[PDB]
Amino acid sequence: DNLRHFVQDYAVRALIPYIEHLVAILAEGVTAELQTRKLGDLYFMFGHYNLAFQSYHQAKRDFNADSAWQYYAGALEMAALSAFMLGTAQRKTYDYMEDAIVCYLTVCKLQQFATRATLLSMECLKTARLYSEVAKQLIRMTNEESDLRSALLLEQAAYCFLVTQPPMHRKYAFHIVLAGNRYSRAGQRKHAYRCYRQAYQVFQKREW
C-alpha cells in the first residue's frame, strides 16, 4: 500500500548513509603491494577509472617480480572495464587482455579464471567490431576438462565465424558437428538437435 512505500522510502533514505560511509572509506583509502590492489577493488564502485588506470599501472611495477599475475590479469580487465565505460577501449588495451589472461594460463593451471575473463572479453569484443579473436582463443580453451563448456563454446565460436563475414564454412560445420555430438554425450538434447539442424543446413548448402 501507500504505507508500504513510506517504509520503502524510509529504507532507501537509510541506505544513503551507507553511500556516505563508503565516501568516508574512500577518504581513509586515499592516503603496499596488496594496498594498490585493494584500492582498485574499492573504487570499482566509486567509478574512479583514472584511479584504476594508475592502479594497473602500479600493478605492473608490482608484479614485475611477482609471478602472481592472476591478480595483474584482473587489473588489466578492470582497466578494460574502466576504458569502455569511458568508451575508449584502446586496441592496445585489448592486447594486454590476452597478455593478461592467456599468458598466465601457460605458467599456472588456473582454468576457471581463464574461463570467466575470456568470456567477459568475448562479450566486450562483441561490443567492439572484432568477433574473431574471441573465437580463436575460445577454440583452444574449448575442449579441455569437459564437453559442456566445449560444446557451448564451439556454438558461440560458430556464430562468431559468420557474424561479420561467412566464408570457408567447411571447417565451421566440421567442428560444430563435434560440438553437437558432445552435446549428445553430455550437453542438452534439444540444443544438440538445433545445432545439428543448422549444421544440416550448412551440409545441404556445401556440396562441391
What does this structure look like?
The protein is mainly alpha-helical and 208 residues long. It has three domains: 1-31; 33-130; 132-208. The protein contains ten helices and no strands. The protein has helices at residues 2-30, 33-46, 49-63, 69-86, 91-107, 111-127, 132-142, 148-161, 169-185, 189-204. α1 (2-30) packs antiparallel against α2, α3 runs antiparallel to α4 (69-86) and α5 packs antiparallel against α6. The longest helix has 29 residues, at 2-30. The termini are far apart.
Which percent band covers the strand fraction? under 5%
Largest sheet: none
Q: Name the shape in a single word.
A: globular
Radius of gyration: 22 Å
Helix content: over 70%
Number of strands: 0
Number of helical runs?
10
Order of helices and strands: HHHHHHHHHH
How many structural domains are formed by the residues?
A: 3
End-to-end separation: 69 Å
In terms of quaternary structure, the protein is monomer
Structural class: mainly alpha
Protein name: FI18195p1
PDB class: exocytosis
Keywords: GEFs, Golgi, Rab1, TRAPPIII complex, exocytosis
Assembly: monomeric
Short description:
It contains ten helices and no strands. The chain is mostly helical. The radius of gyration is 22 Å and the shape is globular.
Features:
FI18195p1; 3 domains; 208 residues
Topology:
Layout: H1 2-30, H2 33-46, H3 49-63, H4 69-86, H5 91-107, H6 111-127, H7 132-142, H8 148-161, H9 169-185, H10 189-204
Helix pairs in contact: 1-2, 2-3, 3-4, 4-5, 5-6, 6-7, 7-8, 8-9, 9-10
